[PDB]
Structure 1
Amino acid sequence: IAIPTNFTISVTTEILPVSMTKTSVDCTMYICGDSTECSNLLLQYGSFCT
């Protein structure tokens, strides 16, 4: 058998992500900017932005 006659105390680092960046997108402003008729066309696609 082999038995230890001494010890070492080791500190080791573990790294874990917990969060992302909370991002939001204004669907209408992304797709159509400030064009009224582009927005009207976008209404034809329903609830995709929602």
Structure 2
Amino acid sequence: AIPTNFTISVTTEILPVSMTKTSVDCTMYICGDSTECSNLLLQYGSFCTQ
């Protein structure tokens, strides 16, 4: 079976390229605005540096 005609088909495909960049502040997330809590968070500072 040999074709005797043709069609020019345009297909659309979508690909995600990136996602929303995000940043997090340990101090104001965990220890919202209290100094007493933020002092206790210093010993865990390494974790946030991760």
Question: What's the TM-score once normalised by structure 2's chain length?
Answer: 0.89
Q: Structure 1: which 5+ residue stretches go unaligned?
A: none
4+ runs deviating over 6 angstroms = none
Question: What's the TM-score once normalised by structure 1's chain length?
Answer: 0.89
Cα distance, 1:33 vs structure 2: 0.7
Q: Structure 2: which 5+ residue stretches go unaligned?
A: none
Structure ranking higher in helix proportion: 2
CA RMSD between the two structures:
0.9
Name which structure has the greater RCO, CA cutoff 8 Å, separation 6+.
Answer: 1
Deviations along 1:1-49, whole A, 9 cap, x unmatched?
Answer: x100000000000100001001111111100011101011111223111
* Number of residue pairs aligned between Structure 1 and Structure 2: 49
Q: Distance in 2 between matches of 1:10 and 1:39?
A: 62
Identity of aligned residues (%): 100
